Design an enzyme around this catalytic site. Structure first.
Site, PDB file in Angstrom:
ATOM      1  CG  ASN A 118     -18.738  17.709  -8.198  1.00 53.33           C
ATOM      2  OD1 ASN A 118     -19.913  17.981  -8.030  1.00 53.33           O
ATOM      3  ND2 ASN A 118     -18.325  16.515  -8.619  1.00 53.33           N
ATOM      4  CG  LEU A 271     -32.132  17.547  -7.374  1.00 54.13           C
ATOM      5  CD1 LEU A 271     -32.391  18.993  -7.019  1.00 54.13           C
ATOM      6  CD2 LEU A 271     -32.988  16.651  -6.492  1.00 54.13           C
ATOM      7  CG  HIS A 285     -24.088   9.325 -13.315  1.00 55.49           C
ATOM      8  ND1 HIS A 285     -23.243   9.771 -12.322  1.00 55.49           N
ATOM      9  CD2 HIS A 285     -24.359  10.402 -14.091  1.00 55.49           C
ATOM     10  CE1 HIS A 285     -23.016  11.063 -12.487  1.00 55.49           C
ATOM     11  NE2 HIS A 285     -23.681  11.470 -13.554  1.00 55.49           N
TER      12      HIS A 285
HETATM   13 CA   LIG Z   1     -29.532  22.135  -9.201  1.00 58.35          CA
HETATM   14 CA   LIG Z   2     -21.970  16.500  -8.579  1.00 58.25          CA
END
Ligand SMILES: [Ca+2]
Ligand SMILES: [Ca+2]
Length: 312
Positions: A118, A271, A285
Protein backbone atom coordinates in the site's frame (compact mmCIF):
# COMPACT_ATOMS: atom_id res chain seq x y z
CA UNK A 1 -6.33 20.60 20.55
CA UNK A 2 -5.83 23.67 18.34
CA UNK A 3 -7.09 23.41 14.76
CA UNK A 4 -6.11 25.46 11.73
CA UNK A 5 -7.98 26.04 8.47
CA UNK A 6 -5.50 26.94 5.74
CA UNK A 7 -6.64 27.66 2.20
CA UNK A 8 -6.68 24.54 0.04
CA UNK A 9 -6.14 25.15 -3.68
CA UNK A 10 -7.39 22.69 -6.29
CA UNK A 11 -4.58 21.08 -8.29
CA UNK A 12 -6.15 18.37 -10.43
CA UNK A 13 -9.40 16.38 -10.65
CA UNK A 14 -11.04 13.08 -11.53
CA UNK A 15 -8.40 10.62 -10.29
CA UNK A 16 -10.20 7.43 -9.12
CA UNK A 17 -8.86 6.63 -5.66
CA UNK A 18 -6.39 9.56 -5.83
CA UNK A 19 -3.34 8.50 -3.88
CA UNK A 20 0.46 8.32 -3.53
CA UNK A 21 1.48 11.94 -4.31
CA UNK A 22 5.21 12.26 -4.95
CA UNK A 23 7.85 14.48 -6.59
CA UNK A 24 10.77 13.06 -8.57
CA UNK A 25 14.33 14.44 -8.76
CA UNK A 26 13.35 16.98 -11.43
CA UNK A 27 10.52 18.35 -9.36
CA UNK A 28 7.84 16.70 -11.48
CA UNK A 29 4.63 15.77 -9.68
CA UNK A 30 2.95 12.33 -9.79
CA UNK A 31 -0.05 10.64 -8.19
CA UNK A 32 -1.67 7.24 -8.62
CA UNK A 33 -5.21 6.24 -9.52
CA UNK A 34 -5.38 2.70 -8.03
CA UNK A 35 -9.10 2.41 -8.69
CA UNK A 36 -9.25 2.92 -12.45
CA UNK A 37 -10.88 -0.20 -13.90
CA UNK A 38 -11.39 -1.85 -17.28
CA UNK A 39 -14.48 -4.07 -17.47
CA UNK A 40 -14.52 -4.25 -13.68
CA UNK A 41 -10.96 -5.57 -13.64
CA UNK A 42 -8.06 -3.77 -11.87
CA UNK A 43 -6.47 -1.25 -14.23
CA UNK A 44 -4.71 1.21 -11.91
CA UNK A 45 -2.60 4.02 -13.31
CA UNK A 46 0.40 6.18 -12.49
CA UNK A 47 0.00 9.78 -13.62
CA UNK A 48 2.26 12.78 -14.13
CA UNK A 49 0.58 16.10 -13.35
CA UNK A 50 1.28 19.50 -14.89
CA UNK A 51 1.24 21.78 -11.84
CA UNK A 52 0.54 24.83 -14.00
CA UNK A 53 -2.46 23.46 -15.89
CA UNK A 54 -3.56 20.55 -13.74
CA UNK A 55 -3.66 18.37 -16.86
CA UNK A 56 -3.09 14.64 -16.38
CA UNK A 57 -0.73 12.32 -18.27
CA UNK A 58 -0.92 8.57 -17.64
CA UNK A 59 2.69 7.38 -17.92
CA UNK A 60 2.15 3.82 -16.69
CA UNK A 61 -0.79 1.43 -16.50
CA UNK A 62 0.90 -1.62 -14.86
CA UNK A 63 -0.04 -5.24 -15.53
CA UNK A 64 1.79 -8.56 -15.24
CA UNK A 65 0.61 -11.56 -17.27
CA UNK A 66 -2.76 -9.91 -17.77
CA UNK A 67 -3.25 -8.96 -14.13
CA UNK A 68 -3.70 -5.22 -13.74
CA UNK A 69 -2.27 -3.34 -10.79
CA UNK A 70 -3.71 -1.25 -7.99
CA UNK A 71 -0.82 1.25 -7.49
CA UNK A 72 -1.37 2.98 -4.14
CA UNK A 73 1.84 4.52 -2.78
CA UNK A 74 5.12 6.00 -4.01
CA UNK A 75 8.66 7.03 -3.08
CA UNK A 76 11.24 8.49 -5.45
CA UNK A 77 14.63 6.79 -5.46
CA UNK A 78 17.89 8.70 -5.03
CA UNK A 79 20.46 6.75 -7.03
CA UNK A 80 18.22 6.99 -10.11
CA UNK A 81 15.21 9.12 -11.07
CA UNK A 82 12.77 6.24 -10.68
CA UNK A 83 9.65 5.62 -8.62
CA UNK A 84 9.09 2.73 -6.26
CA UNK A 85 5.38 2.04 -6.27
CA UNK A 86 3.48 0.01 -3.69
CA UNK A 87 0.73 -1.88 -5.57
CA UNK A 88 -2.12 -3.72 -3.82
CA UNK A 89 -2.08 -6.40 -6.55
CA UNK A 90 1.48 -6.52 -7.87
CA UNK A 91 3.57 -5.87 -4.76
CA UNK A 92 6.51 -3.53 -5.26
CA UNK A 93 7.22 -1.96 -8.64
CA UNK A 94 9.96 0.31 -9.93
CA UNK A 95 8.60 2.77 -12.48
CA UNK A 96 10.69 4.81 -14.92
CA UNK A 97 9.65 8.30 -16.01
CA UNK A 98 9.21 6.92 -19.53
CA UNK A 99 6.46 4.65 -18.22
CA UNK A 100 8.30 1.32 -18.31
CA UNK A 101 8.23 -0.78 -15.14
CA UNK A 102 9.26 -4.02 -13.47
CA UNK A 103 7.76 -6.15 -10.70
CA UNK A 104 10.28 -6.48 -7.90
CA UNK A 105 9.23 -9.64 -6.07
CA UNK A 106 6.73 -12.47 -6.32
CA UNK A 107 8.13 -14.02 -3.13
CA UNK A 108 10.06 -12.65 -0.14
CA UNK A 109 13.43 -13.67 1.31
CA UNK A 110 11.85 -16.64 3.11
CA UNK A 111 10.27 -18.01 -0.06
CA UNK A 112 6.69 -17.08 0.87
CA UNK A 113 4.34 -15.39 -1.60
CA UNK A 114 4.67 -11.62 -1.63
CA UNK A 115 1.66 -9.62 -0.40
CA UNK A 116 -0.04 -6.63 -2.00
CA UNK A 117 1.50 -3.36 -0.84
CA UNK A 118 0.00 0.00 0.00
CA UNK A 119 2.63 2.62 0.91
CA UNK A 120 6.39 2.86 1.47
CA UNK A 121 9.08 5.10 2.93
CA UNK A 122 12.85 5.31 2.37
CA UNK A 123 15.20 5.73 5.32
CA UNK A 124 18.34 7.80 4.67
CA UNK A 125 20.36 4.59 4.34
CA UNK A 126 18.38 3.71 1.22
CA UNK A 127 16.27 0.94 2.74
CA UNK A 128 12.61 1.01 1.74
CA UNK A 129 10.03 0.21 4.43
CA UNK A 130 6.70 -1.04 3.04
CA UNK A 131 3.20 -1.75 4.38
CA UNK A 132 1.27 -4.75 2.97
CA UNK A 133 -2.43 -4.71 4.01
CA UNK A 134 -3.51 -6.89 1.09
CA UNK A 135 -3.21 -10.65 0.81
CA UNK A 136 -0.98 -12.47 -1.68
CA UNK A 137 -0.29 -10.65 -4.94
CA UNK A 138 -1.96 -11.63 -8.20
CA UNK A 139 -2.86 -14.22 -9.45
CA UNK A 140 -4.09 -14.90 -5.91
CA UNK A 141 -7.65 -13.75 -5.22
CA UNK A 142 -7.73 -10.15 -4.01
CA UNK A 143 -8.19 -9.73 -0.26
CA UNK A 144 -7.44 -7.06 2.35
CA UNK A 145 -6.77 -7.17 6.10
CA UNK A 146 -9.48 -4.71 7.17
CA UNK A 147 -11.10 -7.31 9.43
CA UNK A 148 -8.50 -10.06 9.91
CA UNK A 149 -4.93 -9.45 11.08
CA UNK A 150 -2.82 -10.74 8.19
CA UNK A 151 -1.40 -7.44 6.99
CA UNK A 152 2.38 -7.37 6.92
CA UNK A 153 5.36 -5.00 6.88
CA UNK A 154 8.39 -5.36 4.62
CA UNK A 155 11.83 -3.86 4.16
CA UNK A 156 13.43 -3.87 0.72
CA UNK A 157 17.18 -3.55 1.38
CA UNK A 158 19.85 -1.81 -0.69
CA UNK A 159 21.24 -5.25 -1.55
CA UNK A 160 17.95 -6.32 -3.10
CA UNK A 161 16.36 -8.46 -0.38
CA UNK A 162 12.59 -8.32 0.21
CA UNK A 163 12.38 -9.06 3.92
CA UNK A 164 9.11 -9.35 5.81
CA UNK A 165 9.90 -7.72 9.16
CA UNK A 166 6.58 -8.27 10.94
CA UNK A 167 3.00 -9.34 10.34
CA UNK A 168 -0.44 -9.73 11.95
CA UNK A 169 -1.52 -6.13 11.33
CA UNK A 170 -5.12 -5.09 10.71
CA UNK A 171 -4.55 -3.10 7.53
CA UNK A 172 -1.13 -1.42 7.84
CA UNK A 173 -1.35 1.75 5.76
CA UNK A 174 0.76 4.89 6.00
CA UNK A 175 4.39 4.53 7.04
CA UNK A 176 7.30 6.84 7.84
CA UNK A 177 10.86 6.74 9.12
CA UNK A 178 11.96 9.00 11.96
CA UNK A 179 15.64 9.93 11.81
CA UNK A 180 18.08 11.26 14.39
CA UNK A 181 19.17 14.85 13.77
CA UNK A 182 22.42 13.49 12.34
CA UNK A 183 20.48 11.38 9.84
CA UNK A 184 20.56 7.97 11.51
CA UNK A 185 17.30 5.99 11.17
CA UNK A 186 15.96 4.85 14.53
CA UNK A 187 12.18 4.72 14.55
CA UNK A 188 9.64 3.23 12.12
CA UNK A 189 6.10 4.55 12.37
CA UNK A 190 3.28 2.41 11.00
CA UNK A 191 -0.39 3.32 10.68
CA UNK A 192 -3.03 0.66 11.30
CA UNK A 193 -6.19 2.25 9.87
CA UNK A 194 -9.26 0.67 11.53
CA UNK A 195 -7.66 0.48 14.97
CA UNK A 196 -7.12 4.26 15.01
CA UNK A 197 -3.52 3.55 16.01
CA UNK A 198 0.00 4.56 14.99
CA UNK A 199 2.65 1.97 15.83
CA UNK A 200 6.40 2.44 16.24
CA UNK A 201 9.49 0.22 16.30
CA UNK A 202 13.09 0.96 17.14
CA UNK A 203 15.10 0.56 13.95
CA UNK A 204 18.26 -1.38 14.81
CA UNK A 205 19.53 -1.84 11.27
CA UNK A 206 18.58 -2.89 7.72
CA UNK A 207 15.39 -4.95 8.00
CA UNK A 208 15.83 -5.06 11.78
CA UNK A 209 13.17 -3.56 14.03
CA UNK A 210 12.33 -4.21 17.68
CA UNK A 211 9.98 -3.16 20.46
CA UNK A 212 6.59 -2.71 18.84
CA UNK A 213 4.83 0.07 20.77
CA UNK A 214 1.60 2.05 20.46
CA UNK A 215 3.08 5.38 19.34
CA UNK A 216 0.04 7.57 18.78
CA UNK A 217 -3.75 7.61 18.89
CA UNK A 218 -5.96 8.66 15.96
CA UNK A 219 -9.09 10.75 16.84
CA UNK A 220 -12.66 9.79 15.96
CA UNK A 221 -15.11 6.89 15.82
CA UNK A 222 -15.77 7.36 12.11
CA UNK A 223 -15.09 4.55 9.66
CA UNK A 224 -11.51 4.92 8.51
CA UNK A 225 -8.48 6.38 10.25
CA UNK A 226 -4.78 6.99 9.57
CA UNK A 227 -3.96 6.73 5.89
CA UNK A 228 -0.86 8.43 4.40
CA UNK A 229 1.80 10.33 6.36
CA UNK A 230 5.01 12.44 6.29
CA UNK A 231 7.30 14.38 8.64
CA UNK A 232 8.03 18.11 8.44
CA UNK A 233 11.51 19.51 9.13
CA UNK A 234 11.01 19.58 12.92
CA UNK A 235 10.01 15.92 12.86
CA UNK A 236 6.32 16.59 13.44
CA UNK A 237 4.31 13.79 11.83
CA UNK A 238 1.38 14.88 9.65
CA UNK A 239 -1.15 12.09 9.14
CA UNK A 240 -4.20 11.95 6.86
CA UNK A 241 -7.13 10.87 9.05
CA UNK A 242 -9.47 9.41 6.41
CA UNK A 243 -13.11 10.09 7.28
CA UNK A 244 -12.46 12.78 9.88
CA UNK A 245 -11.98 15.81 7.60
CA UNK A 246 -8.60 16.39 9.26
CA UNK A 247 -4.88 15.83 8.90
CA UNK A 248 -3.51 15.16 12.40
CA UNK A 249 -0.20 16.68 13.50
CA UNK A 250 1.80 14.66 16.01
CA UNK A 251 4.87 15.83 17.87
CA UNK A 252 8.21 13.95 17.61
CA UNK A 253 7.24 11.79 20.59
CA UNK A 254 3.73 10.85 19.47
CA UNK A 255 0.84 10.35 21.86
CA UNK A 256 -2.20 12.46 21.01
CA UNK A 257 -2.17 15.00 18.18
CA UNK A 258 -0.86 18.41 19.22
CA UNK A 259 -2.69 20.11 16.37
CA UNK A 260 -5.18 19.32 13.60
CA UNK A 261 -5.71 20.67 10.10
CA UNK A 262 -9.29 20.96 8.88
CA UNK A 263 -9.68 19.95 5.22
CA UNK A 264 -12.45 21.12 2.86
CA UNK A 265 -13.28 17.43 2.41
CA UNK A 266 -13.94 14.38 4.56
CA UNK A 267 -11.45 11.85 3.20
CA UNK A 268 -7.82 12.92 2.92
CA UNK A 269 -5.90 9.85 1.71
CA UNK A 270 -2.27 10.92 1.43
CA UNK A 271 0.03 13.95 1.37
CA UNK A 272 3.54 14.97 0.36
CA UNK A 273 5.66 18.12 0.58
CA UNK A 274 6.93 19.84 -2.54
CA UNK A 275 10.74 19.96 -2.21
CA UNK A 276 12.16 23.19 -0.78
CA UNK A 277 8.72 24.53 0.16
CA UNK A 278 6.09 24.58 2.89
CA UNK A 279 3.55 23.38 0.31
CA UNK A 280 1.77 20.10 1.02
CA UNK A 281 -0.08 18.32 -1.78
CA UNK A 282 -3.02 16.26 -0.61
CA UNK A 283 -4.96 13.47 -2.29
CA UNK A 284 -8.56 12.89 -1.19
CA UNK A 285 -11.35 10.41 -1.95
CA UNK A 286 -14.45 12.54 -1.45
CA UNK A 287 -13.94 14.22 -4.82
CA UNK A 288 -11.08 12.05 -6.10
CA UNK A 289 -8.94 15.14 -6.46
CA UNK A 290 -5.62 16.66 -5.48
CA UNK A 291 -5.15 19.89 -3.53
CA UNK A 292 -2.33 21.86 -1.91
CA UNK A 293 -1.98 24.10 1.15
CA UNK A 294 0.82 25.88 3.01
CA UNK A 295 2.09 24.30 6.24
CA UNK A 296 3.79 26.26 9.02
CA UNK A 297 7.19 25.07 7.82
CA UNK A 298 9.16 23.04 5.29
CA UNK A 299 8.90 19.29 4.98
CA UNK A 300 11.50 16.77 6.04
CA UNK A 301 14.01 16.29 3.22
CA UNK A 302 13.19 13.07 1.36
CA UNK A 303 15.82 10.43 0.57
CA UNK A 304 15.69 11.39 -3.13
CA UNK A 305 16.79 14.92 -2.18
CA UNK A 306 19.97 13.79 -0.42
CA UNK A 307 23.37 13.35 -2.03
CA UNK A 308 25.00 9.95 -2.04
CA UNK A 309 28.38 11.52 -2.88
CA UNK A 310 28.26 14.60 -0.66
CA UNK A 311 30.92 15.39 1.95
CA UNK A 312 28.61 16.00 4.92
CA1 LIG B 1 4.02 11.29 1.08
CA1 LIG C 1 -2.58 4.55 1.54
Amino acid sequence: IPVIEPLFTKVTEDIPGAEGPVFDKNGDFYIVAPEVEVNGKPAGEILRIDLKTGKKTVICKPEVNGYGGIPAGCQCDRDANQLFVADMRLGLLVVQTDGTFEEIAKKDSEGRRMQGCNDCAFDYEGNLWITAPAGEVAPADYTRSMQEKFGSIYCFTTDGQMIQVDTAFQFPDGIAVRHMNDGRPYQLIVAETPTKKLWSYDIKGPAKIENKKVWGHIPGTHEGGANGMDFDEDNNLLVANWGSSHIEVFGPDGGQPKMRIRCPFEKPSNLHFKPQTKTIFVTEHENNAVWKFEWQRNGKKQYCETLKFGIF
